[PDB]
Amino acid sequence: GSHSMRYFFTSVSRPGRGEPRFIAVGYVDDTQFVRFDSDAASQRMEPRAPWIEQEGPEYWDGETRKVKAHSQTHRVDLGTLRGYYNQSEAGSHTVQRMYGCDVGSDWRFLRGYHQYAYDGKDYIALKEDLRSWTAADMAAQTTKHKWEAAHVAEQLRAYLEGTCVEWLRRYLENGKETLQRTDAPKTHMTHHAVSDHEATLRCWALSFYPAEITLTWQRDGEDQTQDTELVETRPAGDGTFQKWAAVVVPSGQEQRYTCHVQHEGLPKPLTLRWE
């Protein structure tokens, strides 16, 4: 099917407590494969998935060199942005940057992305054409004009359409057992009595990969959207994910309710009933 590679960078200033904290992580689909942390001891990009461990020292030295260079530019940016917004030297601020590429189910380039946030709000983003920018603020216009003048979009577009997807395809092949896999949800229901006239039915999906899943309840085949408690999909810690959906069922009505599970790992969508 379709795949993505994404890198996520966070820099946080720490006035009076030394250098800003800088953390970088990379993912292929929903699997993390590398990290860098400015505060940590190694000062190296580090593997976080088993398939990338075989890459070898030119890869690790080069990704270390590049990530340290990203760290420096984000350190400079914190200073620049405090100036653009006329903010005092005292407060902590946050810069975030995300970039990467998607390929379709033919493994060909589909979409590329590069966006930047300051203090949790959109700051500047590369448009879908990979040729122009969307600037949120008056302050971001300065950045937009500077990046237009230095032809930054052109350099990003070359990477997103070429290098990014080539390396995504490399990773998909080298990590085929981890990345071209699906783990189907293992499912069950629980039933707990709220009072003497109703009970909570909870539909569980566990140990699934990728994270994308649809869990719904129906009553007599009508969707119960407004009356379903649904939790955010959450990591198990072992590379798989979990979710549940619950409804409140009045007495004797359990047979009216069905839980429906849609997931790429399933041969057919599931319909589950308490019975």
Binding site: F8, T10, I23, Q32, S92, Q96, G120, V231, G237, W244
Partner: protein
């Protein structure tokens, strides 16, 4: 500046079975700024060997982290996650319910 409150879920990696080793997780997500204090509690007391995932974020820029520790559940021992963040006036404690 933007401040978003952490959602907190506390749960085990595998379905909890007394006497069988597992991992107790506290997943915090949806928050901003990224500074956050997360402890796992055993019978009210801070568990020392707690690790966490590398800071990442969602499409809307909000952060997420998984805090986790090895544990073997028993019938009697109670677990919880205690979280503080600039959006919370006091630390929020969420108890582990071997069913959520």
């Amino acid at each position: 500046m933007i401040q978003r409150t952490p959602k907190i879920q506390v749960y085990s990696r595998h379905p909890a079975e007394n006497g069988k080793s597992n991992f107790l997780n506290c997943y915090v997500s949806g928050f901003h700024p990224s500074d956050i204090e997360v402890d796992l509690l055993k019978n009210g007391e801070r568990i020392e060997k707690v690790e966490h995932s590398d800071l990442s974020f969602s499409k809307d820029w909000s952060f997420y982290l998984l805090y986790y520790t090895e544990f073997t559940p028993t019938e009697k021992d109670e677990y919880a996650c205690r979280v503080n963040h600039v959006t919370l006036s006091q630390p929020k404690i969420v108890k582990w319910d071997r069913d959520m």
